[PDB]
Design a protein around this ligand. Structure first.
Ligand code: FAD
Ligand code: FAD
Lengths: 504, 504
């Protein structure tokens, strides 16, 4: 009795696969879909790089770690539904070094990095050792509201969304009744908390990032043993209609003079694909902006949101060593991460090879923003044919960062000559790592990004289309909400009730 | 009687070549220098790409245009000293289209782009047509102070340097007595004035940019016939000591226990080069941050400036056509530029091929910031080889932007299949296009960047080391100031007096 209908899913990241997974589970009679993926690869920002097929010879280029907090239960539900082999992830480990101003951190010492005014620096003495307390004071009220109810705490956070993190810290909040900090105190707080320049983005983003990385529930963290791409594999195998790779959508349109439900079309390589009742676009917004969307007649501020919503860059560099020297020689036995102001910024010790004593991968450099753009400028699609500036830079920084136990020569001799790096802003299928909004964008541009378009038949889906940026959870919520709206638009009340019964 | 001395110049851009030109002209007895260039190319961000040896078959990847205003007289003096063939450059031309929200601009039309509140958009009615007036009111006081005396106007501008452009517009200046604007008005001003997200950088940078591109003196603009690289060529030939290419410095140091003047050294590819009495680093700050600078004992805030001073990205795309269809079919006969919210953002019509009737180059895309990062994600150093997504995107955008007189088919027909593109953040020898400081950086971090180091023997030189970012003038001022300090440091009063006499 339900008429035949076809929907189009643009992009086969976790968002589009989740839409397909929900539709497949609902089994709506005479409903079909097409998934078009621009890349020859499926998975998007779920991307494990395997150095061999040996058990632990990999690293995750995209998503890799997941906190067990209530706001991410849909992600863990997806893990359980697919049989993902989860293991513990150590956000903090043992003996992980911290190196700033060429000094190592030491507990119970005043200004161990020698950056305070008292030791010839410009960081105020009352700030240099108290970045944790002072940011917890700036973020904590909003963080606990988000712990009660995320949507409600987000709505209250939006009342100060016009401010950057720096502007909030400089002026003492929205009416000056919080502590006010000078430039260098804010500069030190950013250096100790996030990537270079990121306090010049939205205050609300810094709050939510601290909520996810420093949650008040003090959560357990998890990784997928074997790499996150195992999740992509599992979602691929269940698909009723398989992904069509090497199909880049360059135009999306609706024919408003046609009476049928299936009056939407996409253009791929100059050829029309029509007959769609709804199009789900799941790409990053930069890819969407490059399409010809005139046939959708989008609201001008919705088009503005696609162009202007800010993305942060990110770069990862992973090196293979003949043995885990950080474990055996430095005593770094349970993961964690080493932070520094040296160019590599963050060195992540894998949680998934703690028992291995042979070949081991180190995530030697993990950067955001300008740090990632600078490292990324050394990352090529065809690495040079000993002469690699990036390798040499990483080995030198690793030696300085682990100087308490290692030499440059010992680290260099342990290096096998095999490495991989990836800069997400250089990926043509994303154009960045993830949404990280500027001041006022969440409260002003974001609502127009989600506004109904094409008479409720076009949906902009993905991590940037949610309140949970740079996490899998944002992709899943966005995709679920868009399926809701699709079922609502066509008054499929039986299956809408089933969607809420099964997937809410 | 002057003892033998040797100085090191790191980098052979216009900064490094200007230091050598000044030293060559002073002819200081027994003074020599080394200039090391990491690239196999000399010139840095002076970089003309030649599509053949044909006369006008080129475009400038880096610097290309020069306003004849008093604060850039040193640049124009370098042009005359080197006999550069200057021709007029047309910043504004005739019949250049402007395309926003799929509508073309027309003077005297109220809200031609249909973005105002009255027409379904969110841009306030009183802002939509008066962006130039309202930005002139926000920038104008400081622009005229900069026109009287640049350094005095700069010093006064620094008293509001804590604010971003957006923040100045939102709060009505530093005490709320200027007009206050809501998010969408500021958003439209940014869209009409500069690159995506740049109003979230320093207010002082938006003032200085307006001062240079929209100077109160209404100046003549110039370009170098044959491309800017002719300047690099002329500076190279006069060199007493030739540039040593493929010499990447990775460490700079001074041995303070040594009594000699020549107690500084640099490391290149693991090898030591010593004997230097002064080291001029002229690299972009990202390249400086990658070096091992411990042997210099830099002030911690100076190191912070090196790492955190913000750079903007920039991407250029140039296409060759079999005839200048923008001249012949669209009436765009006098250079100028076309602006749009489409991904190409800005289409620059060359001023050096206005009389040609055959093959002609178009600078089809010129972008900054996130616009440039997005276009740059399609720019590969090994071009794809008809499958080129970037080419097709440019052709489609060019057709929509020139739809009043051209079709996609005719533009594609005229395209020869020869194009070149460049994204400066992907260049390992820069890591960006140019300094574009964030809020508070000019007044807080920049003074420590210029602070005396290694007892007055180490200098950080280049466009980022000046009050004139993204211009050749900043590079020359910075190099001149560094030569001054070198002569002062060694008490060479005769030659310091000669520097003032010849080079001020
Ligand atoms: C460096 C990094 C680390 C991360 N770490 C974590 C982590 O630890 N934990 C976590 O939970 N999350 C993490 N994330 C976030 C997570 O990876 C993403 O939020 C999620 O994978 C986004 O999926 P998506 O489907 O929304 O978008 P995408 O993964 O980008 O999928 C969109 C797809 O559309 C395709 N496409 C693009 N253009 C077109 C076109 N024109 N036509 C057709 N298809 C097109 C793309 O190729 C892509 O496959 C990380 C992200 C990054 C960048
Ligand atoms: C897209 C763009 C457009 C521009 N347009 C204009 C314009 O119209 N007008 C204008 O006046 N200005 C313009 N500029 C600015 C102008 O190009 C620059 O200000 C100037 O060229 C910079 O000169 P520099 O010597 O300070 O730096 P650079 O040109 O960067 O010189 C530094 C040199 O150091 C080298 N180097 C780097 N690392 C090392 C190392 N470790 N060891 C040794 N050498 C190293 C680099 O290869 C480079 O040659 C533009 C800039 C850009 C990016």
């Amino acid at each position: 009795e339900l008429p035949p209908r076809k929907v189009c899913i643009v992009g086969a990241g976790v968002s589009g696969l989740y839409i397909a997974m929900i539709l497949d589970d609902l089994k709506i009679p005479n409903l079909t879909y097409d998934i078009f993926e621009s890349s020859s690869r499926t998975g998007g920002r779920l991307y494990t790089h395997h150095f061999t097929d040996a058990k632990h010879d990999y690293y995750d280029i995209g998503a890799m770690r997941y906190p067990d907090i209530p706001s991410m239960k849909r992600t863990f539900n997806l893990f359980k539904r697919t049989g993902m082999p989860l293991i513990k992830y150590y956000l903090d480990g043992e003996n992980t070094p911290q190196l700033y101003n060429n000094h190592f951190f030491a507990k119970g010492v005043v200004d161990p990095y020698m950056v305070s005014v008292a030791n010839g620096g410009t960081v105020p003495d009352d700030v240099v050792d108290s970045v944790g307390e002072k940011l917890q004071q700036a973020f904590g009220y909003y963080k606990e509201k988000l712990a009660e109810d995320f949507d409600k705490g987000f709505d209250e956070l939006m009342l100060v969304d016009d401010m950057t993190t720096r502007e909030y810290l400089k002026r003492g909040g929205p009416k000056g009744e919080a502590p006010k900090y000078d430039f260098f105190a804010i500069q030190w707080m950013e250096t100790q908390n996030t990537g270079t320049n990121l306090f010049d983005q939205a205050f609300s983003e810094s709050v939510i990032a601290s909520f996810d990385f420093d949650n008040p529930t003090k959560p357990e963290w998890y990784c997928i043993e074997g790499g996150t791409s195992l999740l992509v594999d599992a979602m691929k195998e269940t698909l009723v209609h398989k992904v069509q790779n090497n199909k880049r959508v360059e135009a999306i349109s609706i024919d408003l003079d046609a009476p049928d439900d299936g009056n939407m079309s996409v253009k791929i390589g100059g050829k029309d694909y029509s007959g769609y009742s709804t199009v789900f676009n799941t790409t990053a917004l930069g890819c969407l902006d490059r399409m010809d969307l005139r046939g959708l007649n989008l609201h001008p501020t919705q088009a503005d949101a696609i162009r202007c919503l800010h993305y942060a860059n990110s770069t990862k560099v992973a090196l293979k060593f003949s043995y885990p020297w950080w474990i055996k020689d430095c005593g770094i036995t349970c993961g964690g991460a080493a932070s520094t102001d040296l160019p590599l910024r963050t060195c992540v010790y894998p949680s998934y090879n703690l028992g291995d004593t042979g070949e081991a991968v180190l995530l030697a450099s993990y950067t955001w923003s300008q740090d990632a753009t600078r490292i990324g400028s050394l990352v090529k699609d065809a690495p040079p044919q000993k002469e690699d500036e990036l390798v040499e830079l990483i080995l030198q920084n690793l030696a300085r960062l682990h100087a308490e136990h290692m030499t440059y020569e010992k680290i260099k001799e342990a290096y096998t000559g095999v490495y991989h790096a990836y800069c997400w802003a250089n990926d043509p299928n994303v154009g960045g790592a993830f949404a990280l909004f500027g001041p006022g964008q969440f409260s002003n541009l974001y609502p127009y990004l989600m506004r109904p378009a094409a008479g409720g038949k076009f949906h902009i889906v993905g991590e940037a289309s949610s309140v949970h940026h740079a996490w899998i959870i944002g992709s899943l919520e966005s995709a679920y909400t868009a399926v809701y709206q699709f079922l609502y638009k066509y008054k499929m009340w039986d299956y809408l009730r089933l969607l809420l019964e099964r997937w809410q």
